[PDB]
């Protein structure tokens, strides 16, 4: 119950600061003030248009590497096993396969940003 | 067996390659200035950026 | 593709099904399914043309949905029986959903609209894998649970697919789509006889594979992909016409050819089990298949279609493409009925 | 009246027609995944209903 | 001599041929030995 | 507290309902983040720990990459929220009320069955080893390094092949 | 052989004498087609012959 | 071993053999532009291999006996007949054009195969890239039909994208009056009937399409008539070309391997030239095609496969 | 347990329903699939924790791993279709109708 209490207290503190920030200041709302910002000149186009991601390949590769992280995170409890040799062999194979995948991607220019 | 709909259908390309209506690449248009920390105050560099 | 990618991708395509058929655990069978699904897609999209990408996307979405439904079935069976295999006591809806989702994976009707499109999009040498090697795993998953399946659902799907494949075959001019529809019909027979005697389902799978692979390699020979295109073999490669005719007729299922043995034996089993109406209807509707194969035979072997001036240089140039496996499979598929007793 | 017309219409040509009508009814699909998966949804519902009613 | 591009299959691949003939004779010998052994074992297990 | 777990499951249902209604991918990612958090909490309340935290971590990473992809490809001049489309809004409210009414109906027809709102929270945990020590789910998961090495082999191969497959799909 | 030229983008030429003889001869050939009275012809021929001789 | 993935793994990497003079130069020009002399001389000086211009008999000359075959087998298209009657109602003009395009495609495949295999360079006299000029000229003059234009463009779309363009193009520009003068001097009875309008259309197509299109990727040099002579000058220019422009730069071992596999199989090369588009000019009837095929498949040495013709002088058949 | 399993099954059902009926953007369909993945993992996790079966807790992690791999493949396919057509709209994926 303690963790819930403290997290709710943090939420309430942040939200209270926001509400004070929105209801205390004196305001004046008008179109020119409200309109978006772009270095003093009007937007040539809206910011919702497609924005090419030049690291898409590395971004996807991150997914698989993070799942490998997941597979590895049990090691602190694994080492408390009796089959230490088996655990060692399996972890070594896993990490070496990780390294080989990364090395192949590197040698194949996966990490070089796309232009 | 042609029917009402299948009249507008056309034979598929011999090689699988299909001629497509060109996709114009529309680079975004940023305004690197005038009021930018790196524009030295009075440059409206109209950058045309891809990504 | 570089050699290492070829090795890994092909090895994974080979691994997936082997895991599925050598796994005692439902989660591991699901792992085999996912292996096949993931590994096939790069081979499909190898060409990187607009049609290829769309075919790969269709395959991906459909197969992912099927895999999730199967995984739900597995998880609910776990919730019920504390185990990872289907038991006689397992809830009926779980088995119904498994049959339904493996039907979607296999391409059976009415979940069949996806197969023709993907087959049309993808190249022939991968169409062969799609219509042969990728069916072994799902059908194995069913066969391992055959005693518990639902006769009503299975017969409904089977007859639906026979009718749908037969009707779809007529309209199509494209060889790739024609072979997709033939796949649908033959799978319809396979599932029709699955609940009663899976040995004959496996017999039909074997004969269908042994007949389709030769035909796909025949198409690969001249990259033929249309009725008009295949019509030019009398000029480009006359020798193959005889065996192409025999093989199309066998797939249709005429008596002297092997194609009869699957249908005849399956009808025999169904009649033994008193499935007269479904057996009759399936046998009747399996003749549209002979019709839309006979049209091909007419176009290629029995009549000589107009040719082009430039085929003369194709004549001049030499050819070294037909394999030994083509001859072996073609003969052993279209001249083996007298050894039928050993097959069953 | 009979041999060249009515018999041909009744036995061969009626069958030929009906089957062509059915192939042109079924095969022509617009080819969109949205509609295809809608049909798969209808299959879902129908199997559920059959299971329920047959108990 | 007649052909401009050297015929791909100009002379027999002695290696492939010798392998094929050797495999065939070995297969026939093995099969005959196996058939004899099977007959002998059938007689042995069924009292002639 | 009696209604703790049921409330969490209902919130999960609502988040999944929003995702199914399919707003713009940005709101889809936000909804799935909330749903992943609630699911992690359900797992935590069911005695789990490592599994809930792992789902939360992996899902945060996945939605990060997904958002990056959406800003680039899955974008529109006017992204549609849950409330923007009147049909989406109406069916959101309809789904909420429908689930409420379905809960009531199942409770009424089966007083004890799939749902036991009366007696709710009385069957969350079934058994616990009171004086045990090694009962933590991390142990079961780590078993992949000893008793279930086949699981590790297949999963590691899946990721390895994923590297090559992704590179060649994106070539 | 010079490892580098100070100027950026101007890469070292392995066969400078051959390249120069080739270019100068080509120039002297194209000049023949100018009218014999052309001041350009006269001056450019003097210049090119000087450098070719060097 | 046939070049395959196995040989590629074990060696036979194209980049291992490529050298400075391993290029694909294409000499181009209007009729009687002196192309042949310059082509031979460039090839000789640079140590590369010269490929004469593809004719109606190219496939026959390069396969089997190497002897020119009958025209019925070799396309039934006559250049002399084209000049005598260019609008003949038997459709000889477009038949000739399609056959020449297909033969140029075959020659290009052979030259690319040679380059990627031996590592030697190749010099060519016109190619598939430059071939469209003649078709455009025929269409403009009115000798061929718009459907034939459509057909040729379609086949080029199917075939051209697969192969890498030539490294450098060397275009000889000679004005139409002097083209006519040279043709008169050559004094071919049937060639003398080519019209100035036709020659000017060829020249216009060249300048207004081919050179602008090639300069986008290849390295394009233009020599007038007076510069064309003294080929040593052109060899010098080729020597001091620097190719920083073109699809060639981004290739590597595996792309070269797939191109090699495509070219090695001459069937795949010519597959799309036989698309079953039923255009009367190229379409042949079943009876005539069957007669031609039966006649061909009993010519001395063309009944069985290259290695199995006992009549010509092959033996060990019972073992092969 | 019972109410939780009912709500989780309903959640998976709704996400499956969302996947089956599209709505233009392919990315949203991928997200719906991913949500079904979440629900299935939760089902397995709660079942295992309820049964105290620590030998089956290795399996939800395998579910996550393989679902992540397929999601990555899906994202790559989205990238390719976007390169082809300029958007991820599923309407454009209609060529193979012929
Ligand atoms: C019920 C349960 C039991 C079920 C049992 C299973 C039932 C049967 C399963 C279904 C059968 C379908 C099988 C499909 C096989 C593959 C089809 C295909 O697309 O390949 C066409 C393939 C074309 O090969 P090819 O004509 O020699 O092409 C020339 C190569 O390019 C020549 O150059 P290459 O070197 O590139 O050759 C290909 C290369 C490529 O190898 C790889 O890519 C993978 C390994 C790369 C290592 C680097 O492989 C190698 O040579 C090794 C490289 C060293 O032909 C076939 O294999 C079809 C044969 C029919 C088999 C059916 C048997 C049914 C019984
Ligand atoms: C039955 C379905 C018939 C479909 C129509 C087939 C057809 O029209 O043939 C092509 C026909 C075009 O014939 P063509 O233009 O004169 O040249 C084709 C020859 O292969 C030109 O090639 P060639 O003259 O170099 O080789 C001729 C070949 C003769 O090979 C053939 O062309 C005839 C092959 C079909 C024989 C059918 C046997 C009927 C079985 C009765 C049970 O060899 C012989 O002269 C005698 C060898 C002994 C006969 C070969 C039998 C080997 C396969 C047996 C498998 C049986 C499957 C059942 O159209
Ligand atoms: C620990 C450090 C962090 C603390 C963060 C919190 C900050 C707390 C600051 C304490 C001071 C509280 C008074 C702030 C007033 C700020 C806004 C203001 O000045 O409004 C004047 C306004 C001005 O009155 P007015 O509305 O008549 O002014 C004229 C209005 N126009 C221009 C429209 C004609 O007076 C107020 O009503 C403010 C009431 C504040 C209580
Ligand atoms: C039952 C109906 C559920 C909601 C139907 C929404 C409207 C609809 O037409 O269904 C298909 C819908 C795609 O609709 P759309 O492409 O946006 O075009 C709308 C044209 N009026 O597809 C969708 O929007 C997905 C709907 C998922 C509904 C999940 C929640 C249902 C709760 C009951
Ligand atoms: C009791 C059971 C036994 C009875 C079984 C009867 C089954 C007989 C099936 C015969 C089918 C033959 O199918 C035949 O297809 C050809 C195509 O060339 C059609 O051919 C005709 O079609 C239409 C007329 O409708 C014309 O436009 C066309 O030019 C003409 O060729 C025939 O009209 C049809 O009869
Ligand atoms: C109980 C099952 C029994 C199955 C056995 C019978 C098989 C039936 C075969 C059906 C297919 C016959 O295919 C037959 O094709 C011809 C043309 O080829 C169609 O006939 C067509 O002719 C021309 C175009 O070609 C059109 O002008 C005409 O309107 C159209 O109908 C017939 O309408 C169709 O019936
Ligand atoms: N109608 C037509 N004629 C062609 C085509 N390609 C070549 N020709 C003809 O083939 C002949 C080639 O002319 P040439 O110039 O003498 O060929 P070359 O001898 O190799 O090179 P040159 O030095 O210029 O003479 C011309 O009559 C022309 C074509 O595509 N269509």
Identify the CA nearest to A59 among candidates H176, I76, H240, H179.
Answer: I76
F133's tokens: 């020590």
Is-cis flag, bond preceding C110, omega within 30? yes
Q: Taking Cα atoms as reference points, which of C55, I77, I84 lies closest to residue F168?
A: I77
- The 3-state DSSP composition of chain D as helix, strand, coil percent (nearest 5) reads 85, 0, 15
Q: Whose CA is nearest to atom 37 of ligand 3?
A: A26
Cβ pair F142:A82 closer than 8 A: no
Bridge partners (DSSP) of residue H50 are H123
Technique behind the model: cryo-EM
Please tell me if residue H66 touches chain E, with a CB cutoff of 8 Å: yes
C252 contact partners, CB below 8 Å, separation of at least 6: C259, C289, C290, C293, C294
* CB neighbour burial string for H180-201, b if at least 16 within 10 angstroms, e if fewer: bebbeeeeeeeeeebeeebbbb
Length of chain D: 55
Q: Which two tokens stand for residue A112?
A: 């070089």
Residues 131-190 of C with CB under 8 A from H: none
Closest CA to A104 of A51, A54, A64, A46: A64
**Helices F149-170/A56-72 angle, 10° precision:** 180
What CATH number is attached to the domain comprising A23?
1.20.58.1610
Q: Supply the range of the domain harboring residue I69.
A: 2-98
Q: How far is CA C155 from the centre of its chain?
A: 18
Angstrom CA distances, H26 to D19, H35, H61, H136, H208, stand at 58, 10, 21, 20, 18
Residue-wise DSSP of C120-155: HHS-HHHHHHHHHGGGHHHHHHHHTTGGGS-HHHHH
Structural tokens at position C219: 């198409």
C-alpha distances in Å from residue C249, one per residue of C25, C242, C243, H189: 41, 11, 10, 58
Looking up tokens 């971004």, which residue turns up? A59
Q: Are C253 and C260 within 8 A, CB to CB?
A: yes
Asked if H139 and H146 count as a contact pair (C-beta separation under 8 A), the reply is yes
The whole-angstrom separation of Cα C338 and Cα C36 is: 36
Chain B residues in contact with A54 by the CB 8 A cut-off are 51
Q: How many angstroms separate the CA atoms of C65 and I89, rounded?
A: 19
Q: What's the rounded Cα separation, in Å, for the pair C130 and C183?
A: 10
Q: How far apart are the first and last CA of chain B?
A: 49
Neighbours of C205 (CB within 10 A): 22
| DSSP at B16 | S
Whether H306 and E11 lie within 8 Å, measured CB to CB = no
**Closest by CA position to H80, among listed H55, H54, H105, H59:** H55
Q: CA torsion sign, H84 to H86 to H88 to H90?
A: positive
What DSSP string runs through chain H?
A: --SSHHHHHHS--GGGT--TT--EEEEEESTTSSHHHHHHHHHHHHT-EEEPPP-TTHHHHHSTT-S---HHHHTS--HHHHHH-TT-TT-HHHHHHHHHHHHHHHHHHHHHHHHHHH---EEEES-HHHHHHHHHHHHHHTSS-HHHHHHHHHHHHHHGGGSPPPSEEEEEE--HHHHHHHHHHHT-TTGGG--HHHHHHHHHHIIIIIHHHHHTTSEEEEEEHHHHSSHHHHHHHHHT----SSGGGG--HHHHHHHHHHHH-HHHHHTGGG-----TTTEE-HHHHHHHHHHHTTSTT-SS-GGG-TTTT---TTT-
The CATH number that applies at residue I84 is 1.10.287.3510
Strand partners, H49: H122
What residues in A contact F79, CB-CB < 8 Å? 48
Please tell me the total count of domains within chain A: 1
How far is F8 from A46, CA to CA, in rounded Å?
39
Rounded Cα gap, residues C21 and C29, in angstroms: 7
Across the B/C interface, how many CB contacts are shorter than 8 Å?
A: 16
Question: CA-to-CA distance for A76 and A25, rounded, in angstroms?
Answer: 52
The secondary element (H helix, E strand) that includes residue G41 is: helix G39-53
**Which of B14, B19, B20 is the mutation pick for testing H, counting most H CBs within 10 A?**
B14
Instruction: DSSP for H194-222, please give it.
Output: --HHHHHHHHHHIIIIIHHHHHTTSEEEE
Which tokens is H258 given?
A: 């797939």
User: What is the distance between the alpha carbons of residues C258 and C261, in angstroms, rounded to a whole number?
Assistant: 6
Ligand index nearest the alpha carbon of residue D8: 5
Bridge partners, residue B45, by sequence: B32
DSSP-assigned letter for residue G22: H
Sign of CA dihedral C299, C300, C306, C307: positive
Number of other residues whose CB lies within 10 A of the CB of residue C101? 23
- DSSP state letter for C317: S
Please indicate whether, in this complex, the C-beta atoms of C310 and H273 are within 8 angstroms of each other: yes
Q: How far apart are CA A7 and CA C6, in angstroms?
A: 52
The one-character DSSP state at F50 is H
Closest by CA to H53, choosing from H75, H80, H34, H71, is H34
**Tokens representing residue C179 in the block:** 């072979």
Protein residue with least CA distance to atom 22, ligand 2: C239
Quote the number of domains for chain I.
Answer: 1
Residues 6+ apart with CB under 8 A from H291: none
Closest CA to A55 of F30, F158, F65, B47: F65
Residues of chain A whose beta carbon is less than 8 angstroms from a beta carbon of chain F are 46, 48-53, 56-57, 59-64, 66-68, 70-71, 73-78, 80-83, 86-87, 90-91, 93-94, 97-98, 100-102, 104-105, 108, 110
Q: Tell me how far apart the alpha carbons of residues H46 and H69 are, in angstroms, rounded to a whole number.
A: 33
Whole-angstrom Cα Rg for chain E? 21
- Scored b (16 or more CB within 10 A) or e, H56-95 reads bbbbbbbbbbeeebeeebbbbbbeebbbeebeeeebbbbb
Cβ-Cβ contacts under 8 Å, B39 against chain A: 39
Cα separations in angstroms, H173 against A106, H223, H225, H236 = 49, 6, 6, 19
Cβ distance H273 to C313 less than 8 Å, yes or no, reads yes
CA distance F13 to H158: 53
**Max alpha carbon distance in chain E (Å)?**
70
Specify whether the CB–CB gap between G24 and G47 falls below 8 A.
no
Continuous H helices in chain C: 3-21, 26-44, 50-81, 92-106, 114-121, 124-132, 136-143, 151-171, 175-193, 198-221, 227-230, 233-236, 241-252, 260-272, 276-285, 287-297, 311-316, 324-334, 340-343
Q: Out of F5, F74, F158, name the one closest to residue I66 (CB).
A: F158
Cα(H130)–Cα(H100) distance, rounded to whole angstroms?
A: 12
Q: Specify the DSSP class assigned to residue I92.
A: T
Going by C-beta distance under 8 Å and a sequence separation of 6 or more, which residues neighbour residue H250? none
Q: Judge contact between C250 and C334, C-beta under 8 A.
A: yes
CA distance H267 to chain G (A): 44
Question: Cα separation of H237 and H218, whole Å?
Answer: 14
Torsion angle of the four alpha carbons C18, C22, C27, C33, in this order, in degrees rounded to the nearest 10: 20
**CB-CB contact of C306 with H286 (8 Å):** yes
Residue D48 tokens read as 């559920």
Q: Which domain holds residue A24?
A: 2-115
Residue of B nearest to H158 (CA): B15
For residue C4, what are its two tokens? 């290492």
Closest CA to A60 of F159, F58, I73: I73
Tokens of A32: 């020119």
- Residue F133: CB atoms within 10 A of its CB come to 6
Ligand number with the minimum distance to the CA of A25: 3
G44, with CB counted inside 10 A (0-12, 13-18, 19+), is middle
Q: Which two tokens stand for residue A29?
A: 């709302």
Range 51-80 of A in CB contact (< 8 A) with B: 51-54
> Which residues are H28's β-sheet partners?
H171
Say how far apart CA H134 and CA H203 lie, in whole Å.
Answer: 10
Closest chain A CA to residue F159 = A64
Q: Rounded CA gap, F82 and F92, in Å?
A: 8
Chains D and C lie in contact, requiring 3 or more CB pairs less than 8 Å apart = yes
Distance from C-alpha of A61 to C-alpha of F162, rounded to nearest angstrom: 9
């Amino acid at each position: 119950m303690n963790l819930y209490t403290v997290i709710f207290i943090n939420i309430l503190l942040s939200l209270t600061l926001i509400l004070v920030a929105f209801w205390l200041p004196q305001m004046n709302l008008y179109s020119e003030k409200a309109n978006p910002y772009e270095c003093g000149f009007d937007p040539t186009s809206s910011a919702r248009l497609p924005f090419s991601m030049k690291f898409f390949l590395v971004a996807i590769t991150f997914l698989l590497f993070d799942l490998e992280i997941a597979l590895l995170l049990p090691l602190p409890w694994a080492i408390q096993t009796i089959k230490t040799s088996t655990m060692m062999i399996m972890a070594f194979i896993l990490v070496t396969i990780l390294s080989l995948g990364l090395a192949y991607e590197w040698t194949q220019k996966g990490l070089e940003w796309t232009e | 067996y042609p029917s009402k709909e299948t009249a507008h259908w056309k034979p598929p390309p011999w090689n699988d390659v299909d001629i497509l209506k060109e996709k114009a690449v529309t680079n975004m248009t940023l305004n690197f200035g005038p009021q930018h920390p790196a524009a030295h105050g009075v440059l409206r560099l109209v950058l045309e950026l891809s990504g | 593709m570089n050699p290492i990618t070829l090795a890994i991708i092909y090895f994974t395509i080979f691994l997936g099904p082997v895991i599925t058929m050598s796994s005692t655990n439902l989660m591991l069978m699901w792992v085999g399914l996912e292996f096949s699904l993931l590994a096939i897609i790069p081979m499909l999209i190898n060409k990187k043309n607009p049609r290829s990408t769309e075919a790969a996307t269709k395959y991906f979405v459909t197969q992912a949905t099927a895999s999730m439904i199967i995984l739900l079935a597995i998880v609910l069976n776990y919730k019920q029986l504390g185990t990872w295999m289907f038991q006689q006591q397992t809830n009926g809806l779980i088995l119904n959903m498994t049959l339904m989702a493996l039907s979607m994976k296999l391409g059976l009707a009415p979940f069949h609209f996806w197969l023709p499109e993907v087959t049309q999009g993808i190249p022939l040498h991968m169409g062969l894998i799609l219509l042969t090697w990728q069916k072994i795993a799902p059908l194995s998953i069913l066969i391992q649970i055959y005693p518990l399946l639902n006769s009503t659902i299975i017969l409904m799907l089977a007859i639906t697919s026979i009718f749908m494949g037969a009707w779809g075959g007529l309209n199509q001019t494209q060889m790739r789509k024609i072979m997709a529809y033939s796949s649908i019909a033959h799978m319809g027979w396979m599932l029709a006889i699955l609940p009663y005697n899976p040995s004959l389902t496996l017999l039909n799978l074997m004969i269908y594979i042994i007949l389709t692979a030769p035909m796909f390699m025949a198409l690969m020979l001249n990259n033929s992909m249309t009725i008009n295109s295949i019509s030019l073999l009398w000029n480009k490669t006359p020798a193959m016409l005889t065996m192409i005719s025999l093989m199309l007729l066998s797939l249709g299922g005429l008596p002297p050819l092997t194609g009869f043995l699957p249908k005849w034996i399956i009808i025999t089993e169904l009649m033994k089990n008193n499935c007269l109406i479904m057996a009759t209807l399936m046998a009747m509707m399996a003749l549209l298949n002979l019709f839309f194969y006979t049209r091909l035979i007419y176009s290629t072997s029995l009549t000589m279609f107009p040719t082009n001036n430039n085929s003369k240089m194709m004549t001049h140039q030499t050819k070294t493409k037909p394999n030994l496996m083509f001859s072996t499979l073609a003969i052993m598929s279209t001249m083996t009925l007298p050894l039928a007793p050993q097959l069953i | 009246l009979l041999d060249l017309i009515w018999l041909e219409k009744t036995i061969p040509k009626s069958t030929s027609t009906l089957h062509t009508n059915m192939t042109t009814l079924t095969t022509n699909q617009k080819g969109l995944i949205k509609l295809y998966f809608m049909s798969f949804l209808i299959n879902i519902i129908l199997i559920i209903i059959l299971y329920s009613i047959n108990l | 001599k007649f052909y401009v591009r050297e015929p791909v299959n100009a002379k027999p691949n002695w290696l492939a041929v010798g392998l094929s003939v050797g495999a065939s004779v070995f297969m026939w010998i093995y099969l005959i030995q196996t058939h004899n052994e099977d007959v002998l074992e059938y007689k042995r297990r069924n009292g002639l | 507290m009696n209604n703790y777990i049921f409330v969490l499951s209902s919130l999960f249902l609502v988040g999944c309902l929003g995702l199914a209604l399919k707003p713009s991918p940005i709101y889809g990612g936000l909804g799935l983040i909330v749903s992943g958090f609630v699911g992690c909490l359900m797992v935590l309340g069911f005695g789990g720990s490592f599994l809930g935290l792992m789902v939360f971590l992996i899902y945060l990473g996945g939605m990060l990459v997904v958002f990056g992809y959406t800003t680039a490809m899955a974008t529109e001049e006017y992204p549609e929220t849950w409330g923007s489309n009147w049909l989406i809004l109406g069916f959101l409210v309809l789904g909420v009320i429908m689930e409420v009414f379905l809960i009531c109906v199942l409770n009424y027809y089966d007083e004890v069955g799939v749902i036991n709102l009366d007696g709710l929270g009385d069957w969350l945990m079934y058994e616990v080893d009171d004086v045990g020590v090694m009962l933590e789910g991390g142990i079961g998961v780590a078993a992949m390094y000893s008793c279930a090495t086949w699981m590790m082999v297949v999963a590691g191969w899946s990721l390895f092949a994923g590297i090559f497959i992704i590179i060649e799909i994106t070539r | 052989l010079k490892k580098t030229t100070g100027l950026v983008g101007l890469a070292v030429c392995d066969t400078p004498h051959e390249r120069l003889t080739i270019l100068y001869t080509k120039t002297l050939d194209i000049l023949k087609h100018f009218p014999k009275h052309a001041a350009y012809r006269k001056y450019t021929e003097q210049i090119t012959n000087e450098k070719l001789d060097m | 071993l046939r070049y395959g993935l196995l040989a590629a793994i074990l060696g036979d990497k194209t980049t291992k053999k490529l050298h400075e003079y391993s290029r694909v130069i294409t000499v181009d020009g209007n009729i009687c532009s002196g192309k042949n002399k310059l082509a031979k001389e460039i090839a000789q000086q640079l140590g590369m291999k010269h490929y004469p211009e593809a004719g109606i008999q190219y496939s026959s000359t390069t396969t089997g006996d190497g002897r020119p075959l009958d025209i019925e087998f070799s396309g039934s298209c006559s250049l002399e007949k084209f000049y005598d009657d260019p609008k003949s109602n038997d459709g000889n003009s477009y038949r000739l054009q399609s056959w020449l395009y297909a033969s140029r495609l075959l020659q290009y495949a052979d030259a690319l195969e040679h380059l990627l295999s031996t590592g030697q360079g190749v010099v060519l006299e016109r190619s598939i890239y430059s071939d469209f000029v003649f078709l455009e000229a025929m269409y403009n003059q009115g000798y061929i039909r718009k459907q034939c234009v459509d057909h040729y463009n379609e086949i080029k779309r199917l075939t051209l994208p697969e192969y890498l363009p030539p490294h450098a193009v060397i275009y000889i520009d000679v004005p139409v009056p002097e083209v006519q003068s040279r043709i008169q001097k050559k004094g071919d009875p049937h060639e003398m009937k080519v019209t100035s309008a036709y020659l000017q259309d060829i020249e216009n197509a060249y300048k207004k399409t081919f050179l602008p299109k090639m300069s986008e990727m290849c390295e394009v040099l233009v020599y007038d008539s007076w510069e064309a002579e003294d080929p040593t000058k052109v060899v010098e220019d080729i020597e001091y070309l620097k190719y920083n422009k073109g699809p060639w730069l981004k290739q590597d071992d595996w792309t070269f391997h797939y191109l090699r596999m495509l070219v090695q199989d001459k069937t795949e090369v010519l597959n799309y030239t036989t698309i079953p588009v039923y255009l009367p000019e190229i379409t042949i009837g079943a009876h005539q095609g069957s007669r031609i095929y039966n006649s061909f498949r009993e010519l001395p040495g063309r009944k069985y496969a290259p290695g199995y013709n006992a009549e010509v002088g092959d033996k060990w058949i019972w073992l092969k | 347990m019972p109410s939780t399993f009912f709500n989780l099954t309903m959640a998976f059902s709704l996400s499956l329903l969302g996947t089956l009926m599209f709505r233009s953007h392919l990315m949203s369909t991928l997200l719906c699939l991913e949500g079904m993945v979440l629900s299935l993992f939760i089902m397995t996790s709660v079942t295992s924790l309820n049964s105290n079966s620590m030998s089956s807790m290795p399996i939800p992690i395998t579910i996550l791993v393989f679902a992540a791999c397929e999601a990555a493949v899906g994202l790559a396919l989205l990238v390719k279709v976007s390169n082809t057509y300029g958007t991820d709209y599923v309407q454009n994926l209609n060529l193979l109708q012929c």
